[PDB]
Amino acid sequence: GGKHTFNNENVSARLGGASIAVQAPAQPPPYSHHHHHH
Amino acid sequence: RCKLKLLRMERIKDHLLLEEEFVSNSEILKPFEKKQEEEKKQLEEIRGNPLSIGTLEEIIDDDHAIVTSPTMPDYYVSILSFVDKELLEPGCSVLLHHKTMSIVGVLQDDADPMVSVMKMDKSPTESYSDIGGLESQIQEIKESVELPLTHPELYEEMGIKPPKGVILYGAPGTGKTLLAKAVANQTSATFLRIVGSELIQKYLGDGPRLCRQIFKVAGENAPSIVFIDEIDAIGTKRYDSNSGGEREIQRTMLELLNQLDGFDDRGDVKVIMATNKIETLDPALIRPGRIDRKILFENPDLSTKKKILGIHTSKMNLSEDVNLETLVTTKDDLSGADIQAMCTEAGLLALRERRMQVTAEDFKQAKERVMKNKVEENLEGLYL
Amino acid sequence: APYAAKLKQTENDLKDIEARIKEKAGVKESDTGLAPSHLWDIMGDRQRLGEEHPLQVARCTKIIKKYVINLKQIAKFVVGLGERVSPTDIEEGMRVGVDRSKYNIELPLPPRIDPSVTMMTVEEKPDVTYSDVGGCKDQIEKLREVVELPLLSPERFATLGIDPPKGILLYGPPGTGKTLCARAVANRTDATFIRVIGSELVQKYVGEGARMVRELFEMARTKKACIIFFDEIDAVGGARFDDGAGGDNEVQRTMLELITQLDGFDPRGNIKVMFATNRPNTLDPALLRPGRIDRKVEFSLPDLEGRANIFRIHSKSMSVERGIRWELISRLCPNSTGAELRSVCTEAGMFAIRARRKVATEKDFLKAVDKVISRYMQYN
Amino acid sequence: NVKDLKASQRVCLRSDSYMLHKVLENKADPLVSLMMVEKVPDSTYDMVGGLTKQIKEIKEVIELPVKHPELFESLGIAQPKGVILYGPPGTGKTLLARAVAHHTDCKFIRVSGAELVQKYIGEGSRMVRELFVMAREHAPSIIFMDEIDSIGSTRVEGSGGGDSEVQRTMLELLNQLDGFETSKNIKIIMATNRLDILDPALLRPGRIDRKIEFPPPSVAARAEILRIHSRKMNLTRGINLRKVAEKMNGCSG
Amino acid sequence: KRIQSVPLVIGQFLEPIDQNTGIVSSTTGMSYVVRILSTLDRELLKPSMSVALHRHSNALVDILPPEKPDVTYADVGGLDMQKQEIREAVELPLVQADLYEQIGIDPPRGVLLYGPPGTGKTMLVKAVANSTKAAFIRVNGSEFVHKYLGEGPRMVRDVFRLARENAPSIIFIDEVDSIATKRFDAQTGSDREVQRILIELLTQMDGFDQSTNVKVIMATNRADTLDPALLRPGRLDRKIEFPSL
Amino acid sequence: ALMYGPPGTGKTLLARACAAQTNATFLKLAAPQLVQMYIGEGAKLVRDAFALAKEKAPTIIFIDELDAIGTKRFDSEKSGDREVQRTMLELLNQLDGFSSDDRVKVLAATNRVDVLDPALLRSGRLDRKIEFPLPSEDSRAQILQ
Ligand SMILES: Nc1ncnc2c1ncn2[C@@H]1O[C@H](COP(=O)(O)OP(=O)(O)OP(=O)(O)O)[C@@H](O)[C@H]1O
Ligand SMILES: Nc1ncnc2c1ncn2[C@@H]1O[C@H](COP(=O)(O)OP(=O)(O)OP(=O)(O)O)[C@@H](O)[C@H]1O
């Protein structure tokens, strides 16, 4: 009744994103006004 | 306890029921119609044994249509004209003949499994009068959730738009998760049991559609109730987050607060959220429109405790000398859940002396144990 | 010891009998069907094996004086025809029909129209109007002047000499009615509307969501005078950065399908845009540049006068005595939002129901405020 | 028959016809290796000495609700559902959970901390849930845990949340709707070296109904710790190992 | 025996379900149930082993099974007694065990080698392998640290999963003072994971495991910094020192 | 060429102009118009264009938001991480495949330069640059008029 094949391949890309990280050192100011400047 | 005569009535009625249905099935059934004789004899004649499944991106009148699907490529396909042809729509799901493709039937939902897990089938035995520690916190939400299924005239005569969604926070050990399993006993509508952590998945864009499922399935299956617990999992607070995982937590937080109130209305879906620390979380998910009130649980006072242990201890013998009424005198920094332990340890601490019914020594021998663990809250003693 | 011998087994007998019912009935399920035209099944089989085989779609790339194709999955052929017209009816581009056995062409069909975007159009018109809004009377005027007047009265904007703007943005704190005024204007549209679901732009296959963006507009400018309502673009229109983890890398590639499409080489005609936020600082500057956003609006909090006209909306359906004075309730509700008033109008009504009265009062409103807002000596 | 199929199970299909002819089991879950034990450890209660009162609380909570719990229905109280045991290192606490396995008759699961974490968003909180279901079908069952995923008294910032979300699901399982309605035979043990750092949440009764102090020993205490370690040594005659303890208090055990 | 000939096709056993039937998830991509044949072992299959299948049936057929240090204690310089102590700690327990059994004790587990650099620590340990022939795993402590959460303790647990497999085996770590130093507390998120590193390392030796590994050979430049909870006897009990000048 | 600088200095506009005044053809492609799901959908697309531009010559190319593909090397073995950059690897070989005899002339644009891969900036490929500034106050007078 049917002679064709299908050949289900992985022609599609894909991805899994949980790029979870730790540090975040971005920007500590301990001199918000330099604390008497002097 | 001689409740049995209120028990031997029903199993005999579970038996007479068992008497009826097999009898109702066994030859008092009357099968002769064209359905069992003609209908069901034809479908399996053309419907093969395997019926594949897929979707469809577009349709044409006169039994000509299209399919998409993972294992195979697309197709141009005909219809057999017994599917309620003026039903189906894009995005639907289908029943495809196997040797040749052909749209033959369509399913109702086929939504997802996990949503079909979280629903209730059983019913937890806990109830009101399993707790009696309080009077108001029970009430201040009950009138949101349990009357409108019974007594809604009182909300249309006064004629307003009732509330749909609350939150219940406070210090632990006080019976938050409890108070859900009570109301879910006596609701008459469906129910959903969740944690906010459940609904984040590794892949990029599986949550935000998941949250769009359950706020769909509850809508169609109205009336309905939802219960998120420890939602500070996912909805706590937002920041800019130069990262790639924290944001997929936000998209769920942002799609949720679209469902609860946005462009299109949700229906009759009554949320119940729980949490142990608000001020360290929850920016805008906590406002009216979404949650129209906010309940405060705290560690009990004196007079509540008089009713707490009385129901924990309505079964133990304890008949001698206890004088409960000065057992728990001050605040003592203990919740209703430090009660359940003390009724426990002082139950068996008797038993290890091979005595069953109890005295006070067995109690205070426990109370000294629990309270021992307490951190020195008055480690300061600086404030005379 | 007297009777408990029985209760421990008879109770554990129910479940034996209960599931004993599950082994009595069976199961029942359906999918579809029909009663009156119950005799469908004479035309089916004759319709089946005839000249109604299936096809396996593709789309051409070249018509060499034969007929190259490219399947959906990457497999490219070069083919011929049966009875379908070779030279004339076909051209490049279109969707087609190909056999399953030896790949001849047999039938065209039009270009693709994804479901999702048609799941994204709105057809039934909501109910609110600018008379149901809470008296933010100015900010609407900056809104509609973008949207409808360049579609109804362009004879003013054009003749004087101004090319109107074609893009707004809305920002204010929550509970303030950013989405309200936007569901409204769909009522008074006089053209179409779109409710973009942001959840469909972040699929887990690369370069896909962007495909949904551009098709969102190919159908728009096809249509005449479309407008669009995003919401919570803080998800999509987030800022940019460089990280060798960068797990938001993909969603950046989507939005670039947007901004390149909004301002470059004018695929746009008359389509306008609408946005909404609670975080208007983080989102990238490119999406708040003129050209893209020629206009933006601050739904700041209300004032006492405008605060009142919120009550007059949410109070009409209610049973209340004539003689309350709102100029307390407003005065006594400090800086707060549309919603936190709507909860108040409500909960004045609920405390009635807690006592089984039938009409509200003036105090029950006040007894609501202390419950919503929630003493101090160093001010008196 | 097509009604006894406990759904979401795992079966066979026939090539070219797609027809069922067998049934298989729910297991082959991904995390099983460290997630249970197929062969028991080797230790027992007389390999340990110096403390036995501590034991009596364990077998009071663990074994009685499992061995014959008809009793509690007479005593009119609730079964318990967990403990926790604290004290310095070098006392023999992780010893005991190796040793409890020998003499259970119910199975055993063990998770050092840091096996839960799996570096994606929800790969952790899917993993805890993949644990408890593996318990219930194999019921009854015991779990043993060194725990610092539950470290931190709920600090509030960015990427210390990714384990908190692995912490908070587990609190549900111990007193969820279903957990409190289901966690009747499942049981739990956990350990530590500190309890000045954890939440106050795990430390409630309803999740850990009692807790234990493992202190370092007396001198007469330690003497039995040596006889067991020396049972295979030769031990020439003129020994007073009641003294060696006193010449140096082993401040550990 | 015919079909047991070529051309076979590969796969990968997963698990059994019966005395005469198992399953496979081949390399071709899909998963298949399949029946083993007799005239074949069973003791050797349960893990994700390697296998061979019959193509059309997708049946099962038969099983199939499968750095170099060059130094020696004369190629090294002198360093006499330091050498003598690791021959006691490391060489004996691998080729001699009745020694430690009959006395009434158990072997010591690994050691550490403190003392200033450029001193023949690492090379000694290589020679030790070269005599005893056992496997060898060299690795550095600044590799266990990693920025993606949990991307470190996966490592420390992964090597032991194989350092048992190729047993008898040992390890060298040319630096551990980096990730090992006493700290009064962590007011930080990153440095807390350093504890999650260590506490698994400290867990693997002490928890239930095999006995042929003598894995840990901690190298460093000082020893006045480590956690005494790492020095709990059972973990490490043979301090070692080398010259400075 | 390349035209770096911030939003609103007249980048895309100017390419609307240069395509007009010159009596040659002109071409366009947003960068994300290149990237596509399937694992051979992009690279074939770009080998076509430049080849098509060697045909129909002389030509001009416009790449509007190069900040998408041109970031850096996002090292991985996943699908989605490879198929992206592998386009860039074709773009380079396309630039270094022809000469300054055949009369193409490519350019580009961006809002960013602290984000993209210097291999494009290597001597020969995209060398001449333009630091589109903000406008001085004299220029403010022209623009409004
Ligand atoms: N009034 C009361 N009567 C009886 N039990 C009480 C009462 N108040 C508190 N409890 C006890 O408190 C326990 C429930 O604690 P609770 O449900 O508040 O934890 P939880 O914070 O909800 O947990 P989670 O945060 O995971 O939801 C029950 O075991 C219950 O016995
Ligand atoms: N000005 C107003 N007049 C009357 N009702 C209002 C007003 N503003 C807000 N509301 C109430 O708030 C709801 C919508 O508020 P709004 O549009 O501010 O939500 P939102 O800001 O889109 O929410 P989010 O910030 O989470 O997106 C409506 O259902 C309405 O009941």
Ligand SMILES: Nc1ncnc2c1ncn2[C@@H]1O[C@H](COP(=O)(O)OP(=O)(O)OP(=O)(O)O)[C@@H](O)[C@H]1O
């Ligand atoms: N009473 C005892 N009998 C036998 N051995 C003991 C005893 N007390 C301590 N030990 C010894 O102590 C060691 C176990 O220490 P312990 O298990 O307390 O640390 P730990 O619990 O593993 O620490 P952590 O669980 O925090 O990693 C074993 O090597 C054991 O021989």
Ligand SMILES: Nc1ncnc2c1ncn2[C@@H]1O[C@H](COP(=O)(O)OP(=O)(O)OP(=O)(O)O)[C@@H](O)[C@H]1O
């Ligand atoms: N120097 C200029 N001369 C004339 N018009 C200008 C100038 N600078 C900006 N404009 C105006 O700004 C718009 C063009 O902006 P431009 O094309 O620079 O945006 P862009 O920087 O390309 O945005 P993106 O970089 O995100 O593509 C036009 O509408 C134009 O009227």
Ligand SMILES: Nc1ncnc2c1ncn2[C@@H]1O[C@H](COP(=O)(O)OP(=O)(O)O)[C@@H](O)[C@H]1O
């Ligand atoms: N006593 C010695 N005999 C022979 N070679 C030595 C000796 N001491 C040091 N070396 C040399 O030092 C080098 C290795 O130093 P190494 O042990 O790696 O330093 P570290 O221990 O700090 O890593 C080798 O090349 C080796 O030749």
